[PDB]
Structure 1
Amino acid sequence: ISASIGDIIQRLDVLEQDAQIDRLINGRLTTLNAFVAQQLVRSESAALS
Structure 2
Amino acid sequence: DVLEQDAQIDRLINGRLTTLNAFVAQQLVRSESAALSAQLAKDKVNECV
The TM-score normalised by the length of structure 1 is 0.69
| Structure having the larger proportion of residues in helix | 2
Contiguous gaps of at least 5 residues in structure 1: 1-12
- Number of residue pairs aligned between Structure 1 and Structure 2: 37
Contiguous gaps of at least 5 residues in structure 2: 38-49
Give the root-mean-square deviation of aligned CA atoms. Answer: 0.7
The TM-score normalised by the length of structure 2 is 0.69
The runs of at least 4 consecutive aligned structure 1 residues that moved more than 6 Å come to none
Identity among equivalent pairs (%): 100
